[PDB]
Paper text:
M. pneumoniae binds to host target cells by means of a polar structure known as the attachment organelle, and glides in the direction of this differentiated structure at a speed of ~1 µm/s. P1, together with the P40/P90 polypeptides, forms a transmembrane complex called the “Nap”. In the present work, we report the structures of M. pneumoniae proteins P1 and P40/P90 and of complexes of P40/P90 bound to sialylated oligosaccharides. The structural results reveal that P1 (1627 residues) and P40/P90 (1218 residues) present a similar overall organization and topology in the extracellular regions.
Crystals were obtained of the M. pneumoniae Nap protein P1 extracellular region (residues Thr29-Asp1521). This P1 construct, empirically chosen after many crystallization attempts, excludes the predicted N-end of the signal secretion peptide (spanning residue Met1 to Leu59 according to the structural properties prediction program Psipred26). In this construct are also excluded the (predicted) transmembrane and intracellular regions at the C-end of P1 (residues Tyr1522 to Ala1627). The structure of P1 consists of a large N-terminal domain, with Asn60 as the first residue visible in the X-ray and the cryo-EM maps, and a smaller C-terminal domain (residues Gly1395–Asp1521). The N-terminal domain of P1 has a β-sheet propeller topology of seven consecutive blades or β-sheets, each with four antiparallel strands, except for β-sheet VII that contains only two strands. The longest intra and inter β-sheet connections cluster together creating a crown-like structure on one side of the β-propeller opposite to the position where the C-terminal domain is located. In the crown there are 13 disordered loops, spanning 117 residues, which could not be built. The C-terminal domain contains only one disordered loop (residues Thr1483–Asn1495) and has an elongated fold with the same unique topology (according to DALI29) as the C-terminal domain of adhesin P110 from M. genitalium. In the crystal structure, the C-terminal domain is anchored by crystal contacts and the density is clear and crisp, while in the top part of the crown, with few crystal contacts, temperature factors are high and chain tracing was difficult.
Numbering used by the authors: 60 to 101, 106 to 227, 231 to 258, 269 to 276, 283 to 297, 301 to 336, 349 to 830, 848 to 869, ...
Write the structure that this text describes.
Amino acid sequence: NAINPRLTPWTYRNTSFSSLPLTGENPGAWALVRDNSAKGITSQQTTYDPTRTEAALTASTTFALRRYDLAGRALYDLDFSKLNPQTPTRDQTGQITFNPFGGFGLSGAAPQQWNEVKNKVPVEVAQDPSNPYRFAVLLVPRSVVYYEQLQRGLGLPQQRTESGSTTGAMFGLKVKNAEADTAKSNEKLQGASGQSTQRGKVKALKIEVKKKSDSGQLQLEKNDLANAPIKRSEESGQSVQLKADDFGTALSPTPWRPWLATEQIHKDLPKWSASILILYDAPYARNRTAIDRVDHLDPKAMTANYPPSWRTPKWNHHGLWDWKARDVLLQTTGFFNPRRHPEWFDGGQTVADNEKTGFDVDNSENTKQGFQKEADSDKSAPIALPFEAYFANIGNLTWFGQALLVFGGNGHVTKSAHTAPLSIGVFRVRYNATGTSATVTGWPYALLFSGMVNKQTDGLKDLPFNNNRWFEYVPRMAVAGAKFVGRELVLAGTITMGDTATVPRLLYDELESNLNLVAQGQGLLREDLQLFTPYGWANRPDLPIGAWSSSSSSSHNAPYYFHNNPDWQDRPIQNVVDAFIKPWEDKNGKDDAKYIYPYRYSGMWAWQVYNWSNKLTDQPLSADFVNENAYQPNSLFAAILNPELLAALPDKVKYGKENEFAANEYERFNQKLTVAPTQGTNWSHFSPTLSRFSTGFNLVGSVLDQVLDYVPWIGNGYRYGNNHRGVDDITAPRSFLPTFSNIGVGLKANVQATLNLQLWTGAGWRNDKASSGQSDENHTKFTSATGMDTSAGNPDSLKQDSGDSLTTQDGNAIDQQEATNYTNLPPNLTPTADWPNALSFTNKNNAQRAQLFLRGLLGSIPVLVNRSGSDSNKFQATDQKWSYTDLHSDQTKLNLPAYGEVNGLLNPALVETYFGNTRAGGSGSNTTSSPGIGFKIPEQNNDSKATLITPGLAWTPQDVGNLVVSGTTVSFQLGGWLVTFTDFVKPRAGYLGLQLTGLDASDATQRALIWAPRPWAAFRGSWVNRLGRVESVWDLKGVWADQAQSDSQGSTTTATRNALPEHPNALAFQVSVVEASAYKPNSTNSSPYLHLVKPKKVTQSDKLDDDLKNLLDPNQVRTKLRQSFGTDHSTQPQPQSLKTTTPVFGTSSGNLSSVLSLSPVEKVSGWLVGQLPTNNLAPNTNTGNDVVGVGRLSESNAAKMNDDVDGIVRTPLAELLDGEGQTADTGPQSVKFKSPDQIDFNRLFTHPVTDLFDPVTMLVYDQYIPLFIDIPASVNPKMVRLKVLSFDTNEQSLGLRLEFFKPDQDGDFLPLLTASSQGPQTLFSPFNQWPDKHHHHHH
């Protein structure tokens, strides 16, 4: 009873693995099989004990590995729970005892630690490339397979309000402006005090850190970085503070905790770890099976190699000033705080606060703070590897030599709607030469990717991938796989970049006016995208609390610390630098002091990110700033890795003292960014692992914006560009303004201005009209921008400092004759701003673009709205204008928020892609079919109470399929897009670098999948077909079942209960409030975007209306959009599965050479505009495909199938959906081995065995082939060969395999399965016989 007919194929979600096709010497397939009708783990709810759950699962579920032959016929099952395996014997050289007929030599004994690991279930197989009969089998506990049935979600912090006390906070956000501590007024930093009013030796801020030369050691005498004249505020006696208690007590609000702690898995490795067993397999042999050993992937093998700083992730190398500055601003402290990342903490949310950092943060003496501690009580929670994060890292086996590598999976195995468990590193099982012993290790990706520099990529530069000696950047992946492309090892999937969203730091008294940024910094709002709320930012985020106040008790502490405004910045001319920087510059390394220059700094999004994010440079381990780490994967990622180094690297990482944070504040002050790896360490030996990397396209940022506009939004098929004709559109002096491009938007201005370049302003222009009344200036005068016409242009009341300047002069022998500020400023500082000539005024940036691209494919880019689309609060097409004639006269008709939206895009353009208010409001057939959702500029004295929302698609950045290879390209399914890296392994000049094939929303079946509440639950894997096209299969039974049951039928739970649904893209967004007066302009400048948009401080009364807060439940938006598509004329019986195939792309597809042969951004724009061809769904005409390489599936490439799919069995000759269908042919059936008695005795058995075959080729000589086999005259003898499997000169036996030819023209030679009743092989004997008396001829 070899085949258990109760078991059928299945697909492991973490890797998309169902079967492994086997070619070569031991062909056919291995397939995952299980009892697909078992319920698994079996709304009031209950808590499931792991031990009991696993035991219940062992008794109620059945799993096996099913062996298939080359034709696709099932041979036998290996159910490890019922198998009685034996270890194979070896010979004197340590090689496995093996004969192709007898099989493996068996020892009579089961493997060591067998009966404790036998109940684990197989979820992957990888064939040893150096032994076709050897396989690595990955086994996991049954509980891991059914983990999603436990419904262990992550919850919100308990709120003492609701909105939608006071402050208008939603979803438990703690927000209150910080206040001046009157008892710590002396702790204000002091300058160097008279004449010159705009600056402060002569005028810098002094910071001193000095130790006692008297009375471990040190204990400190003075620590100016401990100073805090500003503190958190009180609410009902107690001070407003982040507490792990906010999530409830562990045993209604329950904190999220891992199902099993790291130590619980470690202490019961046979029961709870993932294990690699070594299996021997030979389906045509007598002893067909043997199991050598089992090796456990102990999570502690990985944690033992974690950088030492990971024991203390609430701390960073900036130490006390940074802990204090973040804590006072109601942010999380350190580089990997448990409030943002509870998945990697054994305590989960029970340790989610800024307390117990492993360093003194609250001593009664300031000079005792910043000290590293021992004890057992106040010791930190370390980055660990608990149940969910550990099993996220289990999958994708890759062999290289004697090393078996485990890269991890996409994290779907243990994911929850609001958690993001991912792969933190790579495990390795390194076997010795004979396979009698092995060693197990894990190394984090932080350590493996530690040599990253800009020149390693052909795509986006300056991306937040840089690191430092402290390993503050923690890259984590949703892994597609690790595949060999020729000899090159390619690792790909999605990755978490360093945090950029919370790099700008708000002024201590600006928190209550900027709730979204506070929420992102707090760990509440799990949004990695940069949001556009700059008015309240501090001019720079790297100043200590001592620099925030001033003994002069004026509006903040300008020029040092003030409201960020690039219009107020000092120009770096020789005299400005000489006066304010140079008298302090060469003193920062003397008598224990550091200085904050009286130089006025400021800049927009690209500038904040350039200076204080972990941007890649040309030098590795050079990130002086690693703000934090992303909540979720937020970039496409592919890396070429050195496999020889992976195979050879040591098991135990030896870190140095250079990797540890300083033991006190004195040593930290006198720290050096780059420090030499110390003697006896090996951590630096891991930096050469990664040789090259990709983030998708091979384009510069501003060119990628053009391509992003060409991409359709998978939700309805409309492009982010809204079919904008670029330079040939009517948005400059069928179509709408684009989301990402500035080309043909606003005016093309001849620039130089600040410090010829023909550049487009984009939407949100603020150009001065000029003293003529006709031609609009190519800039904004500093006069127009900074005037008091409380004031957004100058809230801190700064003043202007040979034609004389504007008084308040300084030192030197020149004293001034030129103003410190610039006179001509760029005419755009809104989110669409892209100034290559001015980093200080640019908002678009590569760190954002890499995210916008990934989110653009998933369809989850947030959109800012203030109209719910309900009858009364509807957005109408009459509310929106786009033509340059309409916009030059009145730019508020554009509905550009320039506050609250996603940075680096045009929000009303995005509103239009999603909701189509303009296009739907332009036809009789439907008429107001649009959901009526949008953002309208507030009128009169009315306020706009806006929120970011997602359109309701449920695709996540962990929706990553298996990695497939085709020529020199690699592909994987990312959400509803099949992504192919055409220019990574072998990059070609002038090629875009990616191919994109998406699901088609115009087809009802594909639309049902695109809009499914669990769309990734449908994925059944990709594979490359014989023609090199990528095929993907989708199961639709779950789509139809989920569509048949609506939980949110008329739900208003988000609006009334201040809670989020279990939708994967439900985010804790906050209200963004702007008064109509902010959109009123000012002297020849009538632009509503002249000043930075000044928001309103949020109070209880500034809450969203219920119908708008209800759109924060993404199913409510989804309901509105599906009503708009609304069509059910179904001919039935409804497709149950779908097979998609990538189209054939031409030789010139993606090639820009013909347009790159007008700036490059302008040429790319025109090329894309030339590739452009009412309704709520865009029709698929197929124009948007070939030439570009970006498009939606044609009808012919999307095959609807009548039955559902759980697993797929593939051999080199057959593809069997659920292991069923037509079985392939290995030959003609008429070609077969002769029976011994039918052989011409004198012509064949008379020879000794060694005469009959070439020992070099191991083939029977052509002259002897017809004597062994029956071959009809119609069949060519060259197509048949006899491979020698065995020979024995003692017994004169000869073991042969009959092989038949296929395509190259003499796969190639394949085993002829129908050769004999038993298969393709047979033993012939005895040879070396004395002659008989002629073979009879009767026929």
